[PDB]
Design a protein around this nucleic acid. Structure first.
Lengths: 60, 94, 77, 44, 103
RNA sequence: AGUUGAGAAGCUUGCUGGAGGUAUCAGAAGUGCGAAUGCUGACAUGAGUAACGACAAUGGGUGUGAAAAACACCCACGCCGAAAGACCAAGGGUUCCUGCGCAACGUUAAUCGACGCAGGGUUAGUCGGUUCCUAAGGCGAGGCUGAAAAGCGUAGUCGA
RNA sequence: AACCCACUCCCGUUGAAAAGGUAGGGGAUGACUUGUGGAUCGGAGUGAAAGGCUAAUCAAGCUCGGAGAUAGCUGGUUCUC
RNA sequence: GAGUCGGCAAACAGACUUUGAUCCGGAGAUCUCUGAAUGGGGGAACCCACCUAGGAUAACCUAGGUAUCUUGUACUGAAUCCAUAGGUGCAAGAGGCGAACCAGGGGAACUGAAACAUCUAAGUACCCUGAGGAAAAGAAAUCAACCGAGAUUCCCUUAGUAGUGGCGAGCGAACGGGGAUUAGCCCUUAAGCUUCAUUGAUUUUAGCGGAACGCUCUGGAAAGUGCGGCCAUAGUGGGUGAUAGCCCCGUACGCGAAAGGAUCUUUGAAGUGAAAUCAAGUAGGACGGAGCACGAGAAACUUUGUCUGAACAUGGGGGGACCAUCCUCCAAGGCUAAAUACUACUGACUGACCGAUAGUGAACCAGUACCGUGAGGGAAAGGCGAAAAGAACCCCGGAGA
């Protein structure tokens, strides 16, 4: 959630967080393109976890 | 390269009989890439995300197909298609 | 256009009543000339498209006072 | 026996296109009538 | 809140299965309720070679309406209406015949 | 269907229908249709008649098929060959290819299709465009002009 | 010859075609034919001039408004006694 | 407060939720490309850039800037000495869209007159330009008859009257009354209004509680039958398997707001009103027009395209040619709320409105399909059942229909 990100993690620690869970969005789309993706909830929730690191970064 | 956008460039290995047999015989791998991606972006992304060395990248724009239904004509997303040619002696693994 | 820069007189419309009282739609233009007015306190002529009773206002109020409220309205000269 | 419609995508866009309509006042109100009628295209 | 929810013993008023006590399984969004054991249809399902369905006459339970059931009391053994008692921050749902809580 | 009334019309009933109806007496009207070469939809008649789109031309064998004059292959026979051949621009927009299909579409039948459904397929420093340059012409800072809208146009900057 | 035309015959006239076809015919280095882009438009263009042409429309295009123009004319005006 | 991952679209996957999801309001964040489109171009959704700061290994990337015009301001400076034009930078503002309403600019014609030209239609339609939530108008150089009334706008009458008119067709007042509304302030500087800052208050953007029915009959199913009750600031609501005040959601009636919005109200502040000092190229006049109901007519009064042109409170204008005498007013500077007009858009209630050839063109994926080069034109198409319980299996047929 957001209050685990907010006020506990800094600029770089949320900055290093996006590029770590952009690989999660990348590798899940590499698995979706093949047949090797069973659980499809991971693809939608990695979108909405990038959006809240980018949300708590705009409000720093 | 703006350390994002390496992950936004490659959209998956494209799976066809042409893509499979041209990955076996030659060392060319067919990737669907993002529809606004230059040949330099989809070369530095493969060299970064796969630790491989890229020799050549050719590209395609593909038009979406229009499928007639009731309620009229629909259309699919126009997509993009890159052929990643590597040095002989290495293949991409996922 | 055909408007006096001093009085603001533009063209007016009206009729052309004949002997059998036929109305023809016409237009009343104002008597515009160009004229160069000498300004002493600028040492310079200003050329001004002005109707012929707009020159009567120059002759009555002075060009130095008519140019005071041409630029209050914000015109060319 | 040629007909009256001889198609050309370049002549279609310089007579009836969007920039052409919105270049002139009378065509800039074609685009507002055709939007008040609620049309899907408004430049054909 | 709503009068009836899942882990409730209810009784059917004015249906085919009138007076038949059961327990709510599903609460549907269009004012409907699947109650266990009542309103029981038999679906002629054509079998699948896949893992979805297999077999002939399956006999499942159909949704009722929310007005065709009442909360069963288990104090007077009758059908009863329910209402809400608003106190300190506990909205409990209470019976109307006896004014003591539905639990 | 029966019955009653001078009539418009009423009443009673069998079947079909499966949820509404409105004694009486007043009030209001989108109140009564066969005609307007009326208007909309359905449907006749003409009539299973005319036609089935150049008078290059078809004939056998085999296959597949539920069924082949028309599909595939084979053997022949004809036809075009300054095109009925290969290409490019334009224009169209997936019509290209493969697997499965035949309802509808195809002036007949269709197993075939420019048809349906699903996958695939279009790779450029050199070929075309963009980018560079201008013609006709368009727009046009300012400017000149004009009831207004606007017209004309310089610098410019678009336009093969 | 191509190409551009359109003199004659016949067919076609519910056509294969809202102007063609077949057999002949005129020009074919020119006041030629043509692609592409552009310019001019409704009492207004354009016209080697026929009232021709201006999107199968032209003695004043098309479209939308004035507008349900007007019609001393036409046609029609519906249950009963 | 218990379900959820929007709809056509039912199912299925993979999931999320009482450690409180979905959902509902308030606030913020994101907000690609076009479009006034605004860095430059362009065939709208595309193309090509520049400048500064930071980051990046012969490739770029991130965050801002870069339109024009108006006004204001700073710096700069041609012919030309001075300084004007011009140049450049900074601020601030404008542009575009919207159904009508409003103030203006330009303005038809069919038609009526039983023809037609004056006239009508009609200052209508249409085009164009501004402004506002209303706008315009407005505080007497106004009317009235010797009595008086006092701004404006609006409704009702006077009255189809007076007038006007090829005195044809037509067009049409005013005085005086009855009402709606209720304020007048200033140019020796004002009310009023905008912007903030605050003082209380009232609304709005979501919600919460919300009374009382059983037995019986027919039936597929009861709300209907039959009997007996109950509730009522809640009884002719919606729908539930047939017709329900007591089944459900509501209704009457009470309550409710972290945070915004809006209105009203305190009391300061900066503004504005504001044009300077009671009005001169003005009043008046002559020509030519237009308006006043008034076709220039005995034509007053108002506006003005051309030409002219005053008096100054022992003045000046009006009182329908004009002159005298009375009466009443102070033009050439302004600002003003309410009563009034309209409804594209919201919400609630309502209907002797419509019920799929009707009612919107449009109940349904409608301004769609289709027709046009284009502006533009413009359709047809609702109903299984209470519940999909939407027909397992068998048989003929081409794993058809």
């Amino acid at each position: 959630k957001a209050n685990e990100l907010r006020e506990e993690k800094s600029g770089p620690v949320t900055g290093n967080n996006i590029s770590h869970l952009l690989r999660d969005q990348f590798n899940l789309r590499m698995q979706k393109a093949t047949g090797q993706l069973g659980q499809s909830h991971l693809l939608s929730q990695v979108k909405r976890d990038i959006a809240r690191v980018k949300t708590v970064l705009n409000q720093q | 390269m703006n350390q994002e956008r390496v992950f936004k460039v490659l959209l998956g290995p494209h799976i066809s009989e042409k893509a499979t047999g041209l990955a076996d015989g030659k060392s060319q791998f067919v990737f669907k890439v993002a529809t606004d991606a230059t040949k330099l972006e989809i070369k530095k992304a493969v060299e970064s995300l796969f630790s491989v060395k890229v020799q050549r990248v050719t590209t395609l724009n593909v038009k979406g197909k229009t499928k007639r239904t009731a309620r009229g004509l629909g259309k699919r997303n126009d997509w993009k298609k890159a052929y990643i040619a590597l040095q002989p002696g290495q293949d991409l693994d996922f | 256009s055909r408007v006096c820069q001093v009085t603001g007189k533009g063209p007016v419309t009206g009729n052309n009543i004949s002997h059998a009282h036929n109305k023809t739609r016409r237009r009343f233009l104002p008597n515009l000339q160009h004229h160069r007015f000498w300004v002493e306190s600028e040492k310079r002529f200003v050329r001004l498209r002005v109707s012929a009773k707009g020159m009567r206002i120059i002759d009555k109020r002075g060009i130095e006072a008519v140019l005071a409220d041409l630029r209050a309205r914000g015109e060319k000269f | 026996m040629k007909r009256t419609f001889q198609p050309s995508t370049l002549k279609r866009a310089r007579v009836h296109g969007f920039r052409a309509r919105m270049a002139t006042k009378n065509g800039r109100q074609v685009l507002s009538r055709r939007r008040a009628k609620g049309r899907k295209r408004l430049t054909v | 809140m709503q009068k009836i929810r899942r882990d409730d013993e209810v009784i059917v008023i004015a249906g085919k299965d009138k007076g038949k006590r059961g327990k709510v399984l599903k609460v549907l969004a269009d004012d409907r309720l699947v109650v266990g054991g009542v309103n029981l249809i038999k679906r002629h399902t054509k079998p699948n070679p896949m893992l979805g369905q297999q077999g002939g006459i399956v006999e499942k339970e159909a949704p009722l309406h929310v007005s065709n059931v009442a909360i069963f009391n288990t104090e007077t053994s009758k059908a009863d209406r329910v209402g809400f008692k608003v106190e300190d921050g506990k909205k409990i749902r209470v019976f109307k015949s006896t004014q003591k809580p539905v639990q």
